[PDB]
Each structure stands twice: as structure tokens, then as C-alpha cells.
């Protein structure tokens, strides 16, 4: 019964590990969409039909989106526990009924 | 030339009308008194975005 109670704590802990990476990856989904948009803008600016002025217009879009990428990195969090700012590091999720049965999760 | 000028002056007076009357619920936008305001788009304090219209 000690093992049984520990297994429920392991299911609960593993569920938390699932949700923590779910929130982190969901923010990564928008980051992919933003970078694809900035790649569309980058290809557009490279055209020789664009004079100086429209290149400033693309830069304004790119700079605004670039500050948005830093925004998502520094604001995404799990109940105040920041994820994508690089301060999470490697943390272990204990998914066993005995001490020392964790799994290491790290994101850059 | 004064025929064109009279219409140009009317349009110029219209530009000042658009700038001075365009408002968002009594908050004028294009008259230059808006300045820079922080739009809070986060679930925690100090996560706002600066917007400014000249």
C-alpha cells in the first residue's frame, strides 16, 4: 500500500511533467509562426524592386516581431515559474514509487 | 488657381478635423495628445507593450 500510494503520487507528478512541457511547447508553436512570418518579410525585402523606404517598412515589422519573440521568452511561465527565458534549466520529474526514479527535462 | 486653392484650403481644414475629432470613447487619438501608453498584455505585472501614434 505504500507502493500504491507512491504510484498515485508518481501519476500526479508525471501528469505535472506532461502539462509543464505542454505549456512550454505551446508557446514554441507561436514562435514557429512568428519566425516563418519574419522569413516571409526577409524574402520580400531582398527583392530589387524595393527602394529604401519599403525596406524600413519591413524593418519596422521585423523589429516589432523580434521584440515579440523576446516577449514570449520572458513571459511564458507555469504559475510564475518561467520556462522559455533560459532560467528553468534541467529539472527532474520523479515518476517512481521509490526515491531516485526521475527524468531530466531541459529546454534551451 | 484660386479655384484650386479654395478646395485645397477646405481639404487642409478637413485634415485638422480628422486629427482633432478622431477619438476612441472620448480619448482623442490623432491630435497628438495621446502620447505613449503601455498596453498590459500579460498575466503578471510589468508585461506591457508601448504603443504611440504621432
Amino acid at each position: 500500500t505504500s507502493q500504491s500510494r507512491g504510484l498515485d503520487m508518481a501519476v500526479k507528478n508525471a501528469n505535472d511533467g506532461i502539462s509543464i512541457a505542454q505549456t512550454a511547447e505551446g508557446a514554441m508553436n507561436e514562435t514557429t509562426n512568428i519566425l516563418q512570418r519574419m522569413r516571409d518579410l526577409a524574402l520580400q525585402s531582398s527583392n530589387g524592386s524595393n527602394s529604401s523606404s519599403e525596406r524600413r517598412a519591413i524593418q519596422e515589422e521585423v523589429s516589432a516581431l523580434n521584440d515579440e519573440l523576446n516577449r514570449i521568452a520572458e513571459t511564458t511561465s507555469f504559475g510564475g515559474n518561467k520556462l522559455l527565458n533560459g532560467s528553468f534549466g534541467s529539472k527532474s520529474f520523479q515518476i517512481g514509487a521509490d526515491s531516485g526514479e526521475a527524468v531530466m527535462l531541459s529546454m534551451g | 488657381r484660386r479655384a484650386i486653392q479654395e478646395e485645397v484650403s477646405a481639404l487642409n481644414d478637413e485634415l485638422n478635423r480628422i486629427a482633432e475629432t478622431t477619438s476612441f470613447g472620448g480619448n482623442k487619438l490623432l491630435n497628438g495628445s495621446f502620447g505613449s501608453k503601455s498596453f498590459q498584455i500579460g498575466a503578471d505585472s510589468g508585461e506591457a507593450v508601448m504603443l504611440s501614434m504621432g
Binding site: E30, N33, L65, E68 | I41, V49, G54
Partner: protein, 54 residues
């Protein structure tokens, strides 16, 4: 060099009208630039809405 804006646009003479065509060219760039600046802000907020909802 004397400062001239859209208010001082006086097309009653060819000199004033020739300058006028150039003055509004400078004004259209100012309006288009801030419109594009607002448009970048709007797209930035649209992506923020998707991320916040996600």
C-alpha cells in the same frame, strides 16, 4: 531655409503649387510610415493573442 508644412501649402502660384506637390509627398511618407508602424504593432498583438490563448 524656411519651414513649410501642409498648412502653408498655397497653390495660388506655380511656385507654391510646385512646392506643394513635394510637401504632400513628404506628408504621405509620414502617414504611410506611421500606418505601417501601427500595422506592425497590430500583427504583434495578433500573435500575442494566439500565444496568450494557447
Amino acid at each position: 531655409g524656411r519651414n513649410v508644412t501642409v498648412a502653408d501649402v498655397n497653390v495660388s502660384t506655380v511656385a507654391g503649387s510646385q512646392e506643394a506637390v513635394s510637401i504632400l509627398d513628404g506628408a504621405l511618407k509620414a502617414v504611410d510610415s506611421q500606418r505601417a508602424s501601427l500595422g506592425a504593432f497590430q500583427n504583434r498583438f495578433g500573435h500575442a493573442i494566439s500565444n496568450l490563448d494557447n
